[PDB]
Amino acid sequence: GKYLNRTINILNAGKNIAKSYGHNKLKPIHILSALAKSDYGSTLFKENNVNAANLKEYIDIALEQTRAGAPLDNKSKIVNSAEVKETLALAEAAANKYKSPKVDVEHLLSGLSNDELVNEIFNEVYLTDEAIKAILKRKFEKTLVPR
Numbered sequence: 001g002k003y004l005n006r007t008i009n010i011l012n013a014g015k016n017i018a019k020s021y022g023h024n025k026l027k028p029i030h031i032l033s034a035l036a037k038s039d040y041g042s043t044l045f046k047e048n049n050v051n052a053a054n055l056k057e058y059i060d061i062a063l064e065q066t067r068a069g070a071p072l073d074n075k076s077k078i079v080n081s082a083e084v085k086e087t088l089a090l091a092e093a094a095a096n097k098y099k100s101p102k103v104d105v106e107h108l109l110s111g112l113s114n115d116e117l118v119n120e121i122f123n124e125v126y127l128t129d130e131a132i133k134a135i136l137k138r139k140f141e142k143t144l145v146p147r
Contacts, residue, residue, distance in 0.1 A: 002092060004102045010034045010041065011108075015078040022069030025081040028115035029066060031108070033059050040105045048135060050125045058121045066117075087111040098140040106139050 003011070011026075013034035018026045035041035036055055045052060080088070088103075091111030095103045110132050112118045122128075 002102060004104050006038070006040050007103050007105055007108055010038050010105065013038065017063075018078050019074075019076060020071045021063060021067045022072055024072065024076065024078060026078055026084050027066070027081050028083055028087050028112050028118050029059070029062050031084065031087065032112050032118050032121070033063060035105065035108065035112070038105070041109075044105055044109070044135070048127065048131060050127050055121070055125050058124055062117055062121060083115055087115065090114050094136060098136050099144055100139070104139070106135050110136060 011031065011034070014031040015026050017033050018024075018030040021030065023030070036045060036052075036059060042052065045055060087108070088111060091103045091107045094110040095101075095107040098107070100107060113122060113127075113129060113132050122132075
């Protein structure tokens with residue numbers, strides 16, 4: 001119970017995306033795809049002035065470019081890559097820093113931004129590290145210091 005349910009559902013949707021791209025290992029780009037499609041993540045991107053159509057286009061190009069092969073069989077086991085283990089460690093660090101007891105979508109977003117491919121994509125849609133830090137700070141202020 002270190003993760004909110006909506007974050008777990010994004011991670012699970014990510015594993016299925018990874019599987020469909022022929023990967024046995026979940027990579028940050030698969031999680032980003034799931035996050036961008038999710039109800040909470042999609043709202044998060046639109047509030048923070050990320051063009052949804054452009055973001056989707058860039059994510060899909062990166063996904064197809066990193067495709068390993070045909071979709072794996074439905075029962076194949078997907079595990080976290082070393083990259084994703086770092087994503088989750090960084091997400092957990094971010095949630096802890098901003099006093100969120102469980103990792104929320106914003107904290108996962110921050111963790112994903114450390115991946116080189118995700119970072120390039122964010123650069124192309126104007127989502128700076130400064131902007132992501134602002135998302136986390138504002139979440140802290142709004143939730144724990146409401147006016």
